Design a protein around this ligand. Structure first.
Ligand SMILES: COC1=C(OC)C(=O)C(C/C=C(\C)CC/C=C(\C)CC/C=C(\C)CC/C=C(/C)CC/C=C(\C)CC/C=C(\C)CC/C=C(\C)CC/C=C(/C)CCC=C(C)C)=C(C)C1=O
Ligand SMILES: CCCCCCCCCCCCCCCCCC(=O)O[C@@H](COC(=O)CCCCCCCCCCCCCCC)COP(=O)(O)OCC[N+](C)(C)C
Ligand SMILES: CCCCCCCCCCCCCCCCCC(=O)O[C@@H](COC(=O)CCCCCCCCCCCCCCC)COP(=O)(O)OC[C@H](O)CO
Ligand SMILES: CCCCCCCCCCCCCCCCCCCC(=O)O[C@H](COC(=O)CCCCCCCCCCCCCC)COP(=O)(O)OCCN
Lengths: 65, 101, 92, 58, 40, 98, 488, 37, 147, 311, 90
């Protein structure tokens, strides 16, 4: 969110945060910037990508047996 | 370092020299600014003198109170002069002086 | 970039082993308050030295603002040290 | 003349100091073929990894 | 006065006077000399 | 005496000047080293891109085969609604330090 | 560049004045010419002068508080709420300093570092109110906590003061750890620490899809830490013991100043942290329990300071009623209650310090006070009735408007608990008035007359308490203006 | 209020970050590679 | 591997700290807790913070606690935010994109911190300075008995 | 990768031999200063004396004073010996002859030096002698009080370099050595190292191995501080400032020569001056060296910033 | 999975600190070392989160909280020292 990176460059998730915050700067209803909020929160934790990979692994294991 | 002098609440009075230098603000002191400076300094000196009699240090307490009063009064006068120049306080004389400039 | 600590860890292990060998060579055949004040002063000035290390290295990027910020920090701790001095906590 | 007899142990110390530094220059070179590089940054580390992979490939 | 109190302080506190002098020089250089060089 | 102060204070001035003059040379050398890196970056990045796209083709070929049966799937669907491409995440919170 | 610091002259002045006072005291206390003068009153008077001058600097420079707001954005945020909160805090600090002058002379408290530490705590609270980040809020909280830990154990030879200081430090460090863990859990879940960012990231996803465990846990931990700070039950672990064991001039300051700033922080957390009305439930339970426990515990107290501590807990619950109902008229009731409670507490502690020169410890000690000093008894009875909430006095307005705010949100259970607690409080407050006027003790205790500072403070506060209902408009106007400015 | 995040007082990072966008420590890695020419 | 043992030893050390009879042994295990935490930080690449933990925690605070214990009495006494990734890294390790643009001029943990500790967030730095000054002042007034 | 223990042995064993011969060199120089001859009968010029002393100390049939927990008492010499030896993993002897090239080497040295306080404290407590406990408690405070000044001097050195890498601090002195401008800083650093090691005027003070490990650790600390004094101020392995014709001499020889020179200063200062008192050690270290070190930090930083001579 | 382990270790350290504050109510020193354990756990949380999110707002905060922890140690030990003197016991 701050944009100060660990290695002296721009933060990894700073661009997503600036897209989300720019969306919220001209949208009084927060239900239309949800798609950018989800992107920012997914850049922080990679929950969706990890879930997809876990689903692929589980499907592979089920086919194994 | 990057700096920004813009304020959240805009100035309600005409703005002359939006970002004044220290020397120019000090050179903008009016009679009222000197009056409040001297008042604060004298009050501080008197309080220091009166409060230091019982311990037994009149001169040292006088000087300590005088330093406090000088610092406080100077910063108060600088605050008023800068606000007048920047347009946050009624700058009746400032606009008159800098219009003919 | 952090690969240079494994030699240090192996050095620690081998120094441990050689110290144990050295110990095994002959086997085969009231309260004072100033001691607390000195520790307090050490803690404060050790934190101050800690805060110097980022400043000294990164003194080329920051310029005339970080320098004066560090100067204000040192001024505050110098007032503290002067209070430490005149109160007799530095005497033994 | 006569003061050189106190420089013998003090020169043995210098010999030990020299051998400690020279023991890690011909042992580290022995199993790498290259002297140690000072100032390892992640660019140098990654570029060494790329060197190892390209040498292994061809 | 000043030239006598300062002499008394410096005589009995040489190390403090020396440290204060060198620190004052090190603070004087970036406060009075740096802006002068900024004009050039 | 007095000459001791003169020699120490002149050393502190001339030596600091020489220290600055050597820091200039060190900065120039470091800048040359950095400038030699920005001229070979494109080819290294090109090789990395080729390797990554080949491995990504392999990974998509793998994931398409394993779960062909599942009705709801997209095979390499971006998880970002914006559509930006991001590197595949790893279970290491600092991989390039060891 | 120098004009960017126009937003921090009130803090720069007080910091530099504290430094000058410290240098002056340490130089002249350890002096041979003046035979080690006990210059505690001198430093106290000069510190009061410094507080008044920084009040003049802060109050006059009202349009200049938003100057360079972009440059100072990440550090602190100054607005109308901060302006009035800081002015009130400086006024309370000046009042406490005025009260504690007589303590330095009769009891011979010659340590001048007490005033320096009070000024440093004041600086910490000034930085606390304007803090707009988790980092700044935590740092200011820790600074004031340390300044209070040191002065709580100022009476080194006293058994109570050392134990009170130890308990205070342990409790405060534990609460700070809980709050700091909450801040860490919030930062690790949203990636942001600034209040603007933390509001934009939480205002949309109002637990609409799922409950974020990290965010919920961090919010709960921050709320729990803040509740320890204000001593709302069951987070009142050692608050009565700390209040009793602490020196009376010290207890006067901790009963007023640490509450204004912490309540400001809690408000500036509610502006963004309203995550599913989670805090509204926590503060609801805490307020009910606080009122009930204060009412049921202050009736079993025979000492004046323990009764004051339990009164403080009960009034904290009454104020948290306003937190439980999140609305402009709820925050306004909260701020009015804070103001009135602070003034009543200053009045009561000035009265206690007036009688502390004769070592008053029990309520029965002030038995024949209506005969020896028949005007001090009237003033103390007025203060007690104001605590009770009798209609004609100023203490009724705060409880009235708080109950109105509680009924506005529709919480009828809060109103009944408040009414019962008010009845119990009024009973144990008029119990004190019974002792002064109606009892005829065999042995009397004669007190020595107070000094000018406390006499003037008592006169002004007693005229405020009795005659507040006649002209209450300015307080309501400023409070409504502050409540609206929390968001716009 | 209805959309208080849209207010100017609550949008300060949108005006400060562009001013500090070129400061070292916040730059796009490819930004400095093209500032030579 | 290294993480598991370096965490297990720290847990055992902390358990011994909170459940020790002789406070000297408690302080000694209190030192080992930070000795393990420094290694854990080193595993993260925060070399500066591990060294500061050695310097500050077990260099100043631990020494102070040891002084107080010794000379005085030695008396007796998950799936919500970041779902974990299952061990599927045979293909994931190959899917490692490296951007050489961020490596041409890389900062260290020290200068990265010092770039913004003293200019963009200097007020908090001065507040910590004031906290240190408060500690210095409070050390004397509580504990001082001359002559 | 099985050659790392070879490097560690090659840096540890010659260190111990150098420590023994440093004890011999001390006992020989302190004799030639006093117009006598040191140990000479045992060896050709006394060179075999350390081996004889080591064997005689080993063959003593000593008893362990187990009137304690016996764990802390036995491990305290080990705890100090490990810390004394581990600081040598970062000191560079020439361009590429460093075992571990840390990028935080300066602060790592500060940490290693600061944790060396525990060994003496644990030794003082574990021994039941109350006076030994008090002596260890005083020595720890002295070491701490001068560690502060050592750190502040390290900050002054770091300002002119801009990096914590020890191998780059030497490369930063290719123009001139830092001992020429910062000569008072060099003198203060040498005096602080004298007081840090409990040696020379700042020297206020069991059986078999424990005392041997303490003795070896203290002398290894002496060698390490002599190496640091030339690593930061005398240019490390860099040749003499001028006359670049002797460049055939390896760089590791110059580091050795400068370290031997600083060891000779150690012995000379021990032989030439009496011992301070504790009430004067603490005063000297808290009122004469702290202000001077802080003022030198301020002066160097202000002068470098003013003329833009920063790294 | 490494973030889970890093958070679990610090959570256990925090729990141990709370236990030490609660269980060792009789002894004062344990009630200080447990607070320091809690501060250590929170600092580890901040550093791990800063590394995980690639943000420098956790490292600055860890450095600034080190000062608070040290100052709390100093004040607490001074208060304990004066406390033992008065009552003669812990
Ligand atoms: C105060 O009284 C005392 C003394 O007198 C001053 C001592 O000298 C001493 C110690 C004197 C000594 C000679 C002990 C030092 C012995 C050693 C360091 C053994 C070292 C042996 C090795 C490293 C193995 C040999 C290795 C090689 C040959 C590899 C070659 C490269 C003590 C303990 C003492 O208490
Ligand atoms: C400039 C930056 C700030 C520098 C100081 C920062 C730290 C603050 C330290 C404050 C405490 C020390 C303040 C100075 C103490 C010395 C006071 C002094 O110089 O006056 C002396 C003596 O000097 C004098 O002549 C009196 C000076 C006081 C009156 C001066 C006019 C009032 C000045 C106040 C306003 C201006 C501020 C001070 C000047 C900048 C005191 O007088 P006595 O010794 O009591 O008189 C001797 C006779 N008999 C003992 C019998 C009583
Ligand atoms: C608002 C004005 C504040 C400035 C005055 C601050 C210092 C006040 C002195 C308080 C501390 C002190 O020194 O106590 C003395 C009290 O201080 C004073 O006496 C008055 C000090 C000056 C206050 C008024 C003078 C003019 C100030 C008015 C404003 C101009 C003790 O006097 P005493 O020993 O004579 O008491 C015995 C008594 O005389 C017998 O009945
Ligand atoms: C190539 C190699 C060259 C040699 C390298 C090694 C150098 C050291 C060689 C040995 C030197 C003698 C060592 C003796 C060790 C014990 C001496 C300690 C005595 C001491 O500390 O003096 C104190 C004061 O002097 C002091 O403070 C002493 C420290 C002074 C440092 C110099 C600071 C001068 C700054 C001037 C700067 C001007 C130029 C730059 C602008 C006490 O003395 P006291 O009894 O009076 O008590 C102070 C009351 N005030």
């Amino acid at each position: 969110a701050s944009g100060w990176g660990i290695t002296g460059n721009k933060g990894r998730c700073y661009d997503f945060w600036m897209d989300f915050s720019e969306c919220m700067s001209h949208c009084r209803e927060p239900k239309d910037c949800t798609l950018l909020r989800e992107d920012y929160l997914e850049c922080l934790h990679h929950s969706k990508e990890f879930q997809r990979r876990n689903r692929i692994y589980k499907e592979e294991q089920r086919k194994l047996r | 370092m990057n700096t920004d002098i813009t304020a959240l609440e805009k100035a309600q009075y005409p703005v002359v020299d939006r970002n004044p230098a220290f020397t120019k603000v000090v050179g903008n002191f009016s009679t009222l600014d000197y009056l409040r400076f001297s008042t604060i300094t004298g009050i501080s000196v008197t309080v220091g003198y009166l409060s230091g009699i019982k311990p037994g240090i009149k001169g040292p307490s006088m000087v300590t109170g005088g330093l406090i009063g000088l610092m406080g009064g100077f910063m108060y006068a600088y605050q008023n002069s800068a606000g007048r120049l920047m347009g946050f306080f009624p700058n009746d004389g400032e606009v008159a002086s800098y219009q003919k400039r | 970039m952090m690969l240079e600590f494994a030699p240090i860890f192996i050095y620690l292990v081998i120094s441990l082993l050689v110290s144990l060998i050295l110990l095994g060579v002959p086997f085969l055949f009231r309260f004072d308050i100033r001691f607390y004040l000195v520790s307090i002063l050490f803690l404060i000035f050790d934190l101050e030295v800690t805060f110097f290390f980022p400043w000294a290295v990164s003194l080329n990027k920051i310029d005339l603002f970080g320098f004066w910020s560090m100067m204000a920090f040192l001024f505050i701790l110098t007032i503290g040290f002067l209070y430490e001095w005149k109160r007799g906590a530095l005497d033994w | 003349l006569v003061w050189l007899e106190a420089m013998l142990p003090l020169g043995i110390i210098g010999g030990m100091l020299c051998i400690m530094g020279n023991s890690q220059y011909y042992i580290h070179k022995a199993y790498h073929g290259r002297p140690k590089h000072i100032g390892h940054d992640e660019w140098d580390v990654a570029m060494e990894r790329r060197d190892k992979k390209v040498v292994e490939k061809a | 006065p000043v030239m006598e109190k300062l002499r008394m302080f410096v005589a009995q506190e040489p190390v403090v006077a020396a440290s204060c002098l060198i620190g004052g020089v090190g603070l004087f250089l970036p406060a009075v000399v740096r802006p002068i060089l900024d004009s050039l | 005496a007095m000459a001791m102060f003169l020699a120490v204070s002149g050393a502190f001035a001339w030596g600091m000047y020489q220290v600055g003059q050597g820091n200039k040379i060190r900065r120039a050398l470091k800048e040359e080293k950095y400038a030699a890196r920005r001229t070979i970056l494109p080819i290294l990045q090109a090789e990395e891109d080729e390797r990554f796209v080949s491995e990504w083709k392999k990974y998509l070929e793998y994931e398409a085969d394993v779960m062909k049966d599942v009705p709801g799937w997209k095979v390499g669907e971006n998880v970002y609604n914006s559509g930006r491409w991001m590197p595949p995440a790893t279970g290491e919170l600092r991989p390039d330090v060891w | 560049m120098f004009n960017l610091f126009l937003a921090v002259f009130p803090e720069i002045f007080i910091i530099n004045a504290t430094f000058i006072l410290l240098i002056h005291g340490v130089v002249f206390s350890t002096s041979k010419k003046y035979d080690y003068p006990p210059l505690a009153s001198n430093v106290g008077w000069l510190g009061l002068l410094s507080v008044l001058i920084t009040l003049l600097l802060l109050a006059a420079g009202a349009p200049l508080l938003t100057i360079a707001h972009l440059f100072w954005n990440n550090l602190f945020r100054r607005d109308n709420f901060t302006y009035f909160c800081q002015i009130f805090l400086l006024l309370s600090t000046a009042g406490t300093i005025s009260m504690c002058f007589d303590f330095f002379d009769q009891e011979r408290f010659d340590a001048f570092e007490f005033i320096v530490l009070i000024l440093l705590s004041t600086c910490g609270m000034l930085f606390m109110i304007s803090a707009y980040d988790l980092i700044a809020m935590y740092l200011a909280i820790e600074l004031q906590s340390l300044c209070f830990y040191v002065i709580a154990a100022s009476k080194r030879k006293s058994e109570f003061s050392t134990e009170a200081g130890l308990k205070y430090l342990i409790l405060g460090a534990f609460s700070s750890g809980i709050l700091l863990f909450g801040c860490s859990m919030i930062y690790g879940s949203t990636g942001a620490t600034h209040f603007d960012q933390l509001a934009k990231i939480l205002t949309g996803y109002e637990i609409t899809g799922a409950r974020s465990s990290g965010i919920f846990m961090g919010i709960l931990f921050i709320a729990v830490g803040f509740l320890f700070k204000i001593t709302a039950v069951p987070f009142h672990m050692w608050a009565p013991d700390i209040y009793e064991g602490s020196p009376t001039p010290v207890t006067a300051f901790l009963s007023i100043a640490p509450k204004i700033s912490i309540f400001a922080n809690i408000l500036r957390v509610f502006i963004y942290g309203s995550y599913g009305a989670t805090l509204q439930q926590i503060f609801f339970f805490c307020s009910i329990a606080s009122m009930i426990l204060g009412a049921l515990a202050a009736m079993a107290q025979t000492k004046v300071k323990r009764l004051l501590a339990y009164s403080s807990i009960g009034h904290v619950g009454y104020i948290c009623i306003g937190f439980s109902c999140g609305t402009i008229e709820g925050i306004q009731s909260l701020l009015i209650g804070i103001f009135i409670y602070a003034l009543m507490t200053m009045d009561a502690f000035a009265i206690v310090l007036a009688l502390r020169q004769t070592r008053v410890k029990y309520i029965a000690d002030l038995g024949a006070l209506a005969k020896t000093n028949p005007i001090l008894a009237i003033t103390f009875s007025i203060t007690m009735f104001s605590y009770a909430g009798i209609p004609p006095l100023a203490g009724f307005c705060s409880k009235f408007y708080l109950f109105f705010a509680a009924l506005g949100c529709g919480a009828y259970f809060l109103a009944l608990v408040g009414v019962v607690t008010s009845v119990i409080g009024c009973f144990y407050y008029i119990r004190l008035v019974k002792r002064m006027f109606f009892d005829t003790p065999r042995t009397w205790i004669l007190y020595e007359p107070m000094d000018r500072n406390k006499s003037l403070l008592l006169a002004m506060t007693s005229f405020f308490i009795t005659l507040f209902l006649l002209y209450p408009s300015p307080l309501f106007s400023v409070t409504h203006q502050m409540a609206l400015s929390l968001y716009l | 209020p209805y959309g208080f995040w849209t207010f100017e007082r609550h949008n300060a990072q949108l005006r400060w970050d562009p001013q500090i966008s070129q400061v070292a420590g916040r730059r796009d890695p490819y930004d400095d590679l093209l500032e030579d020419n | 591997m290294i993480l598991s043992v370096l965490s297990s030893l720290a847990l055992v050390s902390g358990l011994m700290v909170v459940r020790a009879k002789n406070p000297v042994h408690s302080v000694l295990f209190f030192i080992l807790v930070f000795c393990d935490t420094s290694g854990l930080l080193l595993l993260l690449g925060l070399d500066f913070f591990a060294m500061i933990f050695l310097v500050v925690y077990i260099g100043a605070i631990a020494v102070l606690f040891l002084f107080v214990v010794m000379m005085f009495h030695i008396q007796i006494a998950l799936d919500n935010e970041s779902i974990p990734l299952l061990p599927t890294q045979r293909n994931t390790t190959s899917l490692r994109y490296t951007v050489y643009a961020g490596k041409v001029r890389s900062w260290t943990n020290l200068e990265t911190l010092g770039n913004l500790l003293y200019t963009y967030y200097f007020v908090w730095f001065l507040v910590s300075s004031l906290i240190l000054l408060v500690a210095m002042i409070g050390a004397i007034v509580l504990t001082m008995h001359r002559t | 990768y099985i050659a790392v223990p070879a490097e560690i042995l090659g840096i540890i064993l010659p260190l111990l031999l150098g420590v023994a011969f440093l004890v011999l060199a001390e006992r020989k120089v302190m004799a030639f200063v006093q117009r006598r001859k040191g140990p000479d009968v045992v060896g050709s010029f006394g060179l075999l004396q350390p081996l004889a002393d080591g064997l005689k100390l080993i063959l003593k049939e000593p008893i362990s004073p187990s009137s304690a927990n016996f764990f802390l008492f036995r491990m305290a010499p080990v705890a100090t010996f490990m810390l004394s030896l581990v600081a040598w993993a970062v000191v560079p002897f020439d361009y590429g002859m460093v075992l571990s090239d840390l990028n935080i080497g300066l602060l790592y040295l500060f940490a290693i030096s600061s944790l060396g306080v525990y060994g003496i404290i644990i030794a003082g407590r574990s021994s039941n002698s109350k006076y030994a406990f008090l002596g260890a408690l005083r020595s720890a405070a002295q070491m701490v009080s001068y560690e502060v000044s050592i750190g502040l001097i390290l900050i002054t050195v770091l300002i002119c370099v801009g990096s914590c890498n020890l191998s780059e601090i030497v490369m930063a002195q290719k123009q001139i050595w830092f001992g020429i401008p910062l000569f008072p800083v060099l003198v203060m650093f040498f005096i602080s190292c004298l007081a840090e090691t409990n040696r020379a005027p700042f020297d206020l003070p069991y059986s078999s191995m424990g005392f041997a490990l303490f003795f070896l650790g203290e002398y290894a600390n002496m060698i390490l501080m002599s190496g640091l004094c030339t690593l930061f101020f005398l240019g490390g392995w860099l040749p003499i400032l001028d006359l670049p014709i002797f460049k055939k001499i390896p760089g590791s020889i110059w580091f050795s020569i400068k370290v031997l020179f600083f060891l000779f200063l150690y012995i000379w200062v021990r032989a030439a001056f009496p011992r301070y008192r504790y009430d004067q050690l603490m005063g000297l270290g808290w009122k004469v060296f702290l202000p001077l070190s802080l003022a030198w930090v301020v002066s160097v930083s202000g002068l470098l910033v003013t003329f833009q001579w920063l790294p | 999975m490494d973030l889970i382990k890093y958070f679990t270790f610090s959570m256990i350290i925090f729990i141990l600190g709370i236990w030490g504050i609660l269980l060792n109510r009789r002894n004062i020193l344990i009630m200080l070392m447990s607070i320091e354990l809690m501060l250590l756990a929170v600092n580890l949380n901040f550093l791990v989160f800063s590394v995980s999110l690639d943000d420098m707002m956790g490292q600055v905060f860890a450095l600034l909280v080190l000062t608070v922890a040290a100052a709390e140690s100093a004040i607490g030990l001074a208060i304990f020292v004066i406390t033992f003197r008065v009552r003669g016991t812990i």
